[model samples]
Every structure is written in structure tokens, then in C-alpha cells.
Target: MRYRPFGSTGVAVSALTLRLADNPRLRANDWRALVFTALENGVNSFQIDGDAPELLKGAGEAFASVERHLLFLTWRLRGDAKQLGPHTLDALKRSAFEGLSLDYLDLLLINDPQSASLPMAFESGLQDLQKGRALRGLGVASRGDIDPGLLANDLVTAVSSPYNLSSGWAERHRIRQASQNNFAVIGEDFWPQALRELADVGGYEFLTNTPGWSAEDICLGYALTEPSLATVRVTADNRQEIERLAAVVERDLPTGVCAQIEMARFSAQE
Candidate 1:
């Protein structure tokens, strides 16, 4: 797997990061297996999104087996900045540090940081965590457009946003702007929601029908092609899906694939 410098954190992360969310379809055992599978495939970066105790313990055991120094882990809080208070922030930290049995989290990301007023207590609480070494760095994740002001915050080490085949001028500009600030860009939602429909836009038959090439794979490859992206996040419940996506890291886009992607982007603009 290819690795890139994760902004100013001094950590090198895998091109693909495995994001473990709370999926009812997956059990605790599946979580352990997924961690192992990801490790075998050269994935050292992981993102934990939920606070379930059973699931955290199961995954924690797997992480414990690996040398802590070799892994890059980030815990993304569930609620937005407006919803985060000292009490809620402390509870979330306890869930991650205690639930996962981890001494320190490599990075903690605030979801929807620009949504509303971030209480002074909440901001100070984050600093307190850092001073205590419970947290190493901070980041921001936005589902919609990110506020440029947040990107300039002193605490932000990275930015997570949607950067995929369907991204338009605004998305592209956001990425460029973030890079200029020396913040690592974590590309999320690699698989465009309108992928199949985009494929039906014509001129992609050769690639769409190519053996061993799925639409998701193409979308992943397209995301990796962006040099500014420090890592791309993907979620998979099974080992096969993990391996398939991991392998895409080593393969470059085929001839004319980029042209087709650009054509699709233009079509999407309408």
C-alpha cells in the first residue's frame, strides 16, 4: 500500500483507511476479523466512529496485539460542535479511551464544526485533553460545505470532506485551499451516490464492462489519483471487500479512464 504524510502530524498513513461504523449487520467477531484483514492488507490507519462497548472491546483486542507506534487511529465524535458540551465531550472521551482501552487517541475529529456556537468550555475541554496527552491532534469533518474559518483554526490538523468523481468546482477548490494551509485532506464518500446513473451517461462502456473493474473500484482509483489527498476512507464489513479496495491502491487508472471520468463530471454539472 502507498503511504502519504498526514499533514503536520508527522504520521505516515496508508492511502486507504478502514472506517468502522456501527452496522447492525456486523457482529463483534466480524469487527475483529475485519481489523485482522485490514492489517494483512497493509492498512495501518483506522477510524472508529461509534461508542458501543462490546464492539469497542472486540476491536480493541485486535489493536492491542499490534505495536501501538505503527498504527494511526482517529476517533470521530457523533455530534456536531453545537451539540458538544463539557459533559458530553467528557463522556465521548471516556467511551473512546475507556471503551477501547486506549491510553491516547492519535486524532479526534469534530463533526460539523461549523454548525453552531462551539462553547468555550468545549474548546477548553479539548485543550485539556491535549495537555493531558489523551488526545494528540484535532480535525474537522463536514458532510456539506466546510466553513473556511474552521480550516484556519489553530487546533485543526486535518479536514475530512467528500472528494470523489462527482465532486464539482466548489469541492475541488476546498481541497486546494486546505492544502495551502498545510492541513491533510481525508477524502470521504469515495463512491459517488449517482455512480450507476453516471455510468449510463455513455462513453464508459469499455471501462464499465471491463473484467475485474467495478464502478466502486473505478471511483476509488479516481479518488486516489488526487495528489492532495493524504488518505481515502472506506467502510467494509467483510474481508473480500477489504481486499478488493486495498488492491485498488496499487493499480493506477487505465488509459482513457480519466478522460471518461472528466466527461462524467461535465455531464454531472448539468
Candidate 2:
């Protein structure tokens, strides 16, 4: 549950952010459990898909109880509907923000980098959210292939991409240049190997995904070892797993071990 400054946002985020997706059984109670557990354990951020209105409704209710503790609410804003015409894109953006109760979404992300019409889409949606004050910033999800220049528009506030042990794309100079422009950077799919690499060349803020690990101890340990990581997102239906993750963050993982483990692991790789 360690926290770090989220780039230039001037807000501190938990090292683990809860991501609520792919869960059909998510209910008000489940959201409550996850939110409460996360807050109590020092997890203060959460991300959700904007396309799912019902899920947003559930999240709104859950967030109502703990709205004060939330650092940021990130919503995914790309899909098949977004690939359509401007009318559809506008509708999708409006649906994602308006449907999410307006107050909860601090960060809205264009899911994938399909630059065909993303610039205009971001500008229009960003204006609406700014007028409504529902969006604090805007961002895009990119892989190695997408051009960072496509996101150079004024409204974009952050850039989230894959950067785990297996993917070192974010560490490149071009990607670093984006961050230097004061864009908040969020990394996902962080694993044992990737965390180590980040610890060695630490400079950016990021969020990690938990479902990738088979064991809670391993997952939490991997995330907490890095000072540059802003948060980690963990999804669970039960409380025991949550408690295990909390315990690992609160007690385990010695201070100097992050860099040591990273070096050892990479050395073995070579």
C-alpha cells in the first residue's frame, strides 16, 4: 500500500490500484468489499472500463461510500464503437462519462492507439468533461507500435502502456520524452522480471496488474519493491486474498531488496 507522486498530478496514489473488469458477477457489495479493502490496505486508486454502464453504476454506488479516499478514477474509452464515425465516437465518450455518474472519472483513457480519428475524439470528449468537471485529465493506451506523436494533442494528460519485465518499451528515449512533457505515465502488466528492471532505472510512475501472479505474496512483493510504481491493481472476489496482499505490503519486502532482487534476476537472465 505504499504511495508515490503521480507525475505532475500532485496527488499520491497507492502502489496497487484495483481494476474491476471481466467480472460479470460484480455487485454493489463486491465493489464495496474491494473499495473498502483497498482503502484500508492503502490502495487509493481504481480503474474501470467506461463502455459498461451497468458496471459504472455499480462503481458509482461503491465509490459513494469512499469517495473521499479515491485518488483518481480511470476509465477505458476505446473499443469497436470508437472505431466508427464521429457520431458514434461522440456517443461513446458521452456515454462513458455521463453514464459513470460524472463525478467519479478523474482520468479517461482511449483504450488502444488507433490514431485515425483519436485526436479529434480526445479533444471533443476532453472539452465536455472539462465543462462538466468530471475529467481531471485525458490519456491514451499505447503499445510499442503506436506513434507517441498521435497523442501530442493538448488535451491528453497521461499515457498508459504495457511495461513489465517482458516489455521494456516504455524505457525507450521516445517514451521518456513523452513523460518529460509532464504527461502522467501509467504502466500495467508488471511482473517479477519487469519490476526489477524498473527499480534499477526508476524515474516514472506506474500501476501494476495482480491477476498475472499465481500467489498474492509474489504479486504484492513484486509491486512494493519499486519506489517508482504509483499503484498496483488487484481483482479478487473474496476477502482472504485481499488480506494476504495487504499483509505482504504492510510487513514483508525488505527495503533494500528491490534493487538487489532486480540485479540478481537480470544477471541470471544473461
RMSD of 2: 6.6
Candidate 1, residue 140: CA error in Å?
0.8
Query: What is the TM-score of each predicted model, taking all chains together?
Result: 0.92, 0.71
Evaluate all candidate structures by whole-model CA lDDT and list the values in order.
Answer: 0.82, 0.59
lDDT of 1 at 185: 87
Candidate 2, residue 77: how far the Cα is off, in Å: 2.1
Model 2 has an lDDT value of 0.59
Compared with the true structure, what per-residue lDDT tens digits does model 2 show for residues 85-112?
4665466456655655555356777765
Clashing pairs in 1: none
In model 2, the runs with Cα more than 4 Å from the true position are: 50-54, 68-70, 80-99, 112-122, 145-148, 169-178, 192-216, 251-270
